């Protein structure tokens, strides 16, 4: 009946955010590791450990189905977490540990289905009557994207259906560059999904990346638990998350999470799920749902009070979210303050921003009032392999006021102490040492457009 033990196919800070969860809950916990994987914290982490993927390269370790799937069943895990990435959103393996009898913590096939294609997830946005970005109709061929851009006008937008955090996305405001993005698109599409669906779209010039945290239910219970602010971006990738948007009215945040809300409802979505939306002078427009537990859910838990991983496992239990969960209203979900959100990792500010390897010599780590820490492997000692990500350690700060929560950001990030690796923490010092981003009025092309942000100064590091 109920689950006892839980699975988590995921490494990292993630495995460990679960566990906790699962212990809260009275779960016993099982992990998974690769043997390139064998020092990381997440493997001791849990009650029981198993070594997946033997004879593979280790991302391909973390990534194989069936091997993970074997593991739970030898273990008797009863639910498979999945965590962010690797195989979150992976239908294959949602559909064979459903087939398997075991819980996949997660939403539905059919909104991972949807979700997972940009054609769908745009059209089922158009079924809801969310306004999506004006774009063409599904994905096109090189000329019907240039007949697009001159029926709309420069500048146009070039999105891999299946690209996923930057990988097949590329501008473009002239013929020729618009030809050279699609032959790039096009070989990302190929090589990292192998499915060359390409749509095109109206290029927003400087937006606000606003995504809104959605927990759904079986019963047919959906809630927002508001929205983060994921604006300050280098080069498409989130480098800074904060919630909630403190530079939008709120009336404007409450009508983008009603929007979120009832594309949701109109989907049926159950489990927890991230609506993306970009939002430029009162206009939103939505983009993408990512259809699994996001990796700075944590900063709407501070400002919620609500444990979403916690809300995951009881909504996959199959609880009712207000009734068994104990969540209130949607009226009385609370803003209790504005959170900040910082991923410390190994990539280089100096040098272009590759992920760094190294050993750890010492390791410092802050604490305190307004605090929240999220780490990964990053112990001292802890050897960083350059097979995974750059993630070390993500720190989050909450209070109040959001000018307050700018302050304790920036005593963690100086009090922050790696050595032996080298971090991105000069550069989230820079960041949110800028007025634009305490304003509030970052926006996706704050990065790009400040070339003041990667003036990083000396330090004497003495020892
Ligand atoms: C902790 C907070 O409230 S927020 C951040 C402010 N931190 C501090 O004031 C702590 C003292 N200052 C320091 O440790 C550093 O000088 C910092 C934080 C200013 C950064 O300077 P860095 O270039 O990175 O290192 P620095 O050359 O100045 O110091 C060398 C070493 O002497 C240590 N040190 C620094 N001040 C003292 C001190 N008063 N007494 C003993 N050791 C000290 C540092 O911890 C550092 O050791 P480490 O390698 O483990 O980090
Ligand atoms: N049409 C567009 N005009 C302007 N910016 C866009 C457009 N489409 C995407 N972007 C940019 O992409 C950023 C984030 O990418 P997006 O949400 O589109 O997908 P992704 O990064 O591929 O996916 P995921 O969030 O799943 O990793 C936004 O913050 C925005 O700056
Ligand atoms: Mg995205």
Known sequence: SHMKKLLVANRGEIAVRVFRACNELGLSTVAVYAREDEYSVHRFKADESYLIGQGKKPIDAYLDIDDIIRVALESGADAIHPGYGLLSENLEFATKVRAAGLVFVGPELHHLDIFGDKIKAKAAADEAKVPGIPGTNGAVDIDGALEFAKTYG??????????????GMRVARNDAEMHDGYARAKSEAIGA?????????????????????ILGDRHGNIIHLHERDCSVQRRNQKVIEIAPAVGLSPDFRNEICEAAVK????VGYVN??????????????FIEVNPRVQVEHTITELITGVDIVQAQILI????????????????????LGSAIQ????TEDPQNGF?????????????????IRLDVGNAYAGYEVTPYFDSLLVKVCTFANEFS???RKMDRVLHEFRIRGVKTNIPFLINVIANENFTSGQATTTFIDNTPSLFNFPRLRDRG
């Open 316 to 335: 996959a239990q199959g609880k009712d979210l207000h009734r068994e969960i104990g969540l209130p209203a949607q009226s009385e979900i609370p803003l």
């Open 272 to 285: 927890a799920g991230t609506v993306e939306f970009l939002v430029k002078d009162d206009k939103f427009y």
């Open 404 to 406: 307050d929560s700018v």
């Open 263 to 266: 594309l949701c409802k109109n």
């Open 342 to 345: 910082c991923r410390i990792t």
């Open 154 to 167: 420069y500048p146009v937008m070039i999105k891999a259906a299946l690209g996923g955090g930057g990988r």
């Open 193 to 213: 999904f192998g499915s060359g669906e390409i749509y095109v779209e109206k290029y927003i010039e400087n937006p606000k990346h606003i995504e809104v945290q």
């Open 354 to 370: 590759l992920p760094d390897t190294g050993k750890i010599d010492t390791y410092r780590s802050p604490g305190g009032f307004g």
